[PDB]
């Protein structure tokens, strides 16, 4: 597994009820452009960011998705390098607790990411794994069970009330 260079966090809440904090580690050396994008969206430096956004797609035994802070349905989001950016590294493989980039085909990374809650090998080579949950994995296994409707969207919104850096 890659070396962790930086640490970010998400304080999560499901409809007024605080769940806790997800501390994430970032593989800065194996995917510098990608982790930088992530880091700066966590702080909010450029005006926009993951703060107040939600996890619009949660699927038990698979993953939880988020990062659409411009449409909240999974059709939006934007990187700090404009609209989209090429995939830096596709050599790192997925594992439970990994941070990976969600996309729309090759070289279409934006701001949407997912955290895996089970083995997703069939995804290797197509999504840039750029980090791992260092702590707050139980907070992730909590969200995973929340009630969703068709389209796998959370009935009660799962919100990132605060995101930052350590």
């Amino acid at each position: 597994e890659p070396e962790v260079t930086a640490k970010v966090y998400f304080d999560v809440m499901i409809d007024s009820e605080p769940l806790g904090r997800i501390t994430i580690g970032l593989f800065g050396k194996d995917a510098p452009l990608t982790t930088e994008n992530f880091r700066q969206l966590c702080t909010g430096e450029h005006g926009f960011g993951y703060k107040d956004s939600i996890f619009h797609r949660v699927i038990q035994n698979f993953m939880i998705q988020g990062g659409d802070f411009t449409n909240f349905d999974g059709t939006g989001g934007k990187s700090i390098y404009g609209e989209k950016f090429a995939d830096e590294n596709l050599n790192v493989k997925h594992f439970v607790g990994a941070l990976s980039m969600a996309n729309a085909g090759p070289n279409t990374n934006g701001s949407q990411f997912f955290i895996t809650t089970a083995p997703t090998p069939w995804l290797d080579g197509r999504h840039v794994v750029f980090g791992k949950v260092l702590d707050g994995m139980d907070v992730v296994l909590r969200i995973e069970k929340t009630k969703t409707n068709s389209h796998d969207r959370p009935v009660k919104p799962v919100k990132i009330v605060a995101s930052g850096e350590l």
Partner: peptide, 11 residues
């Protein structure tokens, strides 16, 4: 299937 896309979301 089991994909994590941004926009379409298929099988």
């Amino acid at each position: 299937x089991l994909l994590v896309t941004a926009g379409l979301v298929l099988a």
